[PDB]
């Protein structure tokens, strides 16, 4: 669910100032974590994307004598590759939204790491 | 190669030993090297498979052209079993390569984080 | 040249001799030079091969144009051409080498920074 | 000019005389100038050749456009790319482009050699 | 202005008189100014020429499009991609563009120059410190 | 405003009175303010003029879309438009002033550093 | 108003040498003051920027009933007004960035002058 990722990133970006020191190392770990999410979403999408391509050919074959005789009307009833591919594709757009969220997450962590260094510096400035 | 295994490897790599910050700085540059090497080898493989794919594409094009609508050829072939398989492979490596690019970004910023932490320590002094 | 051998060379190069952190600092700039030279020479080679490819392409265009391929297919088929595929494969390979060398130069520049950082942590230890 | 000779020149230039770390520091800025000068002049040459190429392209375009052999226009783009006179001039231009990229690298190199120099000076200050 | 002459000027400028390391430090900032001034004036000129170039391009487009350039007309009918090529070949346009690009080269040289003066200033401080070390 | 006059003013500003190295340090920060002020006001003006230009562009676009201007070429012809060319020339000119002022702020910051360095050479002769 | 920020910074950067001591502490307070200005300005611009996106979408609809769509919409009086505002705040923000740079280095100049005093001793 997207909301759960929103809540997760939200929780993650907050900084504990005394372990501002701890947080610097931990900052790189968030990057890793979200990178992993990123790749897995892409991986999933690729598989589903692959599936859609095959479904299209099958439906294409359906829709467009001498040679075997396949019953066109039962082909139509049984195959429903339109309904099914389209359904799965709707799902795929959902994942596209997730992937866009993960991109936002990495931009966020990179700049959080900078903000962290900045605050450390403004403190050193107060000194 | 498996993407999950690269994920776990990067995971291991990004961890920082606070007591060995100096070591980690040098090893950080070594990590940069390691992932750069992974990167180049993955792209190399993908390039080879890409050549194979260009050939599969030509062969299937021949099949479909009768050597059926001209326009449908693009769709069907894009969907061609053999082509779909080789293309799937190629795209998979493309995903690995993108992961390695992310990895190099990660190591570069880990190196910066390292400098930052050193600074917060000298500040504590 | 082999990409793997450049990988091993860079691998060797990035290793740091801590007592000759001092030596390495000067030696670090020399590494930059070495890889920059490699870098340029690779592009140079690729440019020559690229020129050859352009001629091959014209020949294949002639081949395909009949001087029964479809014009869009002309693009596809020619891209698939054995000879063109071979020369292009080579050219792209060199492109990979070039990208590796770009990575190498980034690597040495930051190794130089890491070196200064370590020097500083030492003076801190003092 | 030859690329390898620039490679050797940069090679010689980047070497550091540690006692004349002091001399080298001043000389370091002079190196920047020298390569900067090389840099602008190569681009200048390339610019002239680039103009020539554009004219050659039009000329070859005319040849190819029928204004000997009859090439389809998208294919005209391909064939003209094959243009021996054009190919020669472009190849040349790109060669200078290679030189230019090398000089950009060189200036980056001198900038950081200057930093390395300060670093070494600091390790010297460290032995104290 | 000539690029080679700017090369010689910068060459002269970057040289350091060590006893007047003191003089040079102040003079170093003055050099920045001098080249900054050069810099801006060069860009200014190029901008004027750039405006001129834009007009030439429209005129040549008309020429090439069969729309005429004064009492002169291009009996040729150019394809738009070819329009791009042919106009790129435009002798008058090529001349003005060549000029403009030349000034662009001068400008890039001046940017390098300002970088140079900035780092000469740094080298100066560093050297002062190495002097104090002895 | 004229660019040359800014060149002369900056020229005057960057000069250092060594005995009032003390005075100059404080005045150096005041210079920053002055040029920062110049800087912001110039961009503000250019922004207003930029708005005017955007309107001019639309007007000329209308003119050109039906003035017989070709649809693909519109960018070129308009780029050459008398009114547009005038307003754009102005705007770019102010852009030149802005870039000069940025250089100026860089200059004052480093003049401040040079000042600290010289003070140090004085503590140094002792 | 930008001019008023110019006058405020102008007042801020002037240095009282005897209260070089006072000024050092007051210097950090200035940093704070302008940092707060800075953040609040970005926040406002961000809010206005959101509004602009909606205005843009509305105007896009208007215009769609494509490249010229981009040109004309850029010319979009309502969009032009909101963008003008947004850019204005961007100018203020850049000014405040300059201001923070100014206070940081004024702080350095103060330490330096303190040192020349230490020099006569």
First to last CA, chain F: 47
Question: Which residues lie below 8 Å from residue F125, measured CB to CB, with a gap of 6+?
Answer: none
Q: Name chain C contacts of B58, Cβ cutoff 8 Å.
A: 76-77, 80
Separation CA C55–CA D12 (nearest Å): 39
8-state DSSP, A67: S
Separation CA E60–CA E86 (nearest Å): 10
Minimal CA separation from E95 to chain F, in Å: 18
- Are G104 and A125 in contact (CB < 8 Å)? yes
- Are F121 and E51 in contact (CB < 8 Å)? no
Report yes or no: A25 and A126 within 8 Å, Cβ to Cβ: no
Report yes or no: B110 and B16 within 8 Å, Cβ to Cβ: yes
| Residue C23 half-sphere exposure toward CB, CA atoms < 13 A | 6
Report yes or no: D49 and D89 within 8 Å, Cβ to Cβ: yes
Minimal CA separation from F52 to chain E, in Å: 19
Residue B66 backbone zone (phi > 0: left; psi -120 to 50: alpha; other: beta): left
Separation CA F98–CA F105 (nearest Å): 11
Chain D residue at shortest CA distance from E82: D61
Chains that touch A (3 or more CB pairs under 8 A): B, G
- Are A24 and B117 in contact (CB < 8 Å)? yes
Q: Name chain B contacts of A25, Cβ cutoff 8 Å.
A: 15-16, 18, 113, 117
Would you state the structure tokens that stand for residue E2, as one six-digit string?
């000539």
Cβ-nearest to F96 among E21, E44, E59: E44
8-state DSSP, A16: -
Dihedrals phi, psi of C83, to nearest 5 degrees: -65, -45
C-alpha closest to that of F81 among F97, F63, F93: F63
Chain A residue at shortest CA distance from B102: A35
Report yes or no: C108 and C35 within 8 Å, Cβ to Cβ: yes
Resolution at which this structure was determined, Å: 4.2
- Are D10 and C33 in contact (CB < 8 Å)? yes
Report yes or no: D40 and E3 within 8 Å, Cβ to Cβ: yes
Chains that touch E (3 or more CB pairs under 8 A): D, F
Chain E residue at shortest CA distance from F16: E26
Separation CA F47–CA F43 (nearest Å): 6
CA dihedral F82, F85, F87, F93 (to 10 degrees): -150
Q: Name chain E contacts of F107, Cβ cutoff 8 Å.
A: 29, 32-33, 36
**Domain-wise residue ranges, chain B:** 25-124
- Are E130 and D54 in contact (CB < 8 Å)? no
Q: Name chain A contacts of B122, Cβ cutoff 8 Å.
A: none
Separation CA B11–CA A37 (nearest Å): 12
Report yes or no: A12 and A101 within 8 Å, Cβ to Cβ: no
Residue that is written with structure tokens 């709707």 in the block: A90
- Are D102 and C55 in contact (CB < 8 Å)? no
Residue that is written with structure tokens 């009859």 in the block: D70
Separation CA D96–CA C44 (nearest Å): 10
Tally: H helices and E strands in chain B? 4, 0
Separation CA F100–CA E40 (nearest Å): 6
Question: Which residues lie below 8 Å from residue C52, measured CB to CB, with a gap of 6+?
Answer: C87
Separation CA F63–CA F86 (nearest Å): 17
Q: What distances in angstroms separate CA C113 from CA A13, B123, C15, C24, C120, one per listed residue?
A: 28, 20, 14, 12, 11
Q: Name chain A contacts of B119, Cβ cutoff 8 Å.
A: 120, 124
Chain E residue at shortest CA distance from F122: E22
C-alpha closest to that of C36 among F64, D112, E105: D112
Instruction: Say what angle helices G77-120 and G2-13 make with each other, to 10 degrees.
Output: 10
Q: How far from the centroid of its chain's Cα atoms is residue E24's Cα?
A: 27
Q: Which of D89, D102, D121 to mutate to test the interface with C (most CBs of C within 10 A)?
A: D102
Dihedrals phi, psi of D108, to nearest 5 degrees: -60, -40
Report yes or no: G110 and G14 within 8 Å, Cβ to Cβ: no
Separation CA C75–CA D77 (nearest Å): 13
- Are F96 and E29 in contact (CB < 8 Å)? no
DSSP-assigned beta bridge partners for residue E69: E72
Would you state the structure tokens that stand for residue A119, as one six-digit string?
């605050």
Rg (CA), chain D: 23
Element of type H or E holding C116: helix C82-125
Question: In this complex, does chain B touch chain C, defined as having at least 3 beta-carbon pairs under 8 Å apart?
Answer: yes
Kindly report the number of other CB atoms within 10 A of residue B50's CB atom. Answer: 20
Helix/strand/coil for F32: helix
Report yes or no: B45 and B93 within 8 Å, Cβ to Cβ: yes
Dihedrals phi, psi of E72, to nearest 5 degrees: -110, 145
- The alpha carbon dihedral of C66, C67, C70, C73 has a sign of positive
DSSP-assigned beta bridge partners for residue B31: none
Separation CA C66–CA C58 (nearest Å): 12
Question: Which residues lie below 8 Å from residue D62, measured CB to CB, with a gap of 6+?
Answer: none
Q: What distances in angstroms separate CA B108 from CA B14, B28, E14, one per listed residue?
A: 11, 8, 35
Q: Name chain B contacts of C2, Cβ cutoff 8 Å.
A: none
Chains that touch B (3 or more CB pairs under 8 A): A, C
> How were these coordinates obtained?
X-ray
Separation CA G102–CA F37 (nearest Å): 12
Cβ-nearest to D7 among C37, C54, C61: C37
Helix/strand/coil for E72: strand
| Residue C30 half-sphere exposure toward CB, CA atoms < 13 A | 10
C-alpha closest to that of D63 among D88, D48, D84: D84
Would you state the structure tokens that stand for residue C117, as one six-digit string?
């950082």
- Could you say which of 3.90.1070, 3.30.420, 1.10.150, 1.10.287 is the CATH number of the domain covering A2-126? 1.10.287
Q: Which of C23, C29, C30, C66 to mutate to test the interface with D (most CBs of D within 10 A)?
A: C29
Residue that is written with structure tokens 């030859």 in the block: D2
- Are A113 and B117 in contact (CB < 8 Å)? no
Separation CA D77–CA D68 (nearest Å): 16
Cβ-nearest to D14 among C30, C43, C47: C30
- Are A43 and B69 in contact (CB < 8 Å)? no
Q: What distances in angstroms separate CA C122 from CA C23, C117, C125, one per listed residue?
A: 16, 9, 5
Contacts 24+ apart (CB under 8 A), F83-91: F83/F56, F83/F59, F84/F53, F84/F56, F84/F57, F84/F60, F85/E51, F85/E54, F85/E55, F87/F49, F87/F52, F87/F53, F87/F56, F88/E51, F88/F53, F89/E47, F89/E48, F89/E51, F90/F49, F91/F46, F91/F49, F91/F50, F91/F53
Helical residues (DSSP H) of F1-126, grouped into ranges? 3-14, 21-65, 74-79, 82-125
Q: What distances in angstroms separate CA B53 from CA A47, A50, G77, one per listed residue?
A: 18, 16, 52
């Amino acid at each position: 669910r997207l909301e759960d990722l929103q809540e997760e990133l939200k929780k993650d970006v907050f900084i504990d100032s005394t372990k501002l020191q701890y947080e610097a190392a931990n900052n790189v770990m968030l990057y890793s974590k979200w990178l992993n999410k990123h790749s897995s979403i892409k991986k999933e999408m690729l598989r589903i994307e692959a599936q859609k391509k095959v479904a299209l050919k099958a439906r294409l074959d359906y829709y467009s004598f001498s040679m075997d005789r396949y019953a066109a009307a039962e082909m139509k009833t049984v195959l429903s590759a339109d309904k099914d591919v389209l359904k799965v594709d709707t799902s795929l757009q959902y994942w596209g939204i997730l992937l866009d969220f993960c991109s936002g997450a990495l931009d966020a962590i990179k700049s959080r790491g900078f903000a962290i260094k900045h605050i450390q510096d403004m403190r050193a400035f107060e000194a």
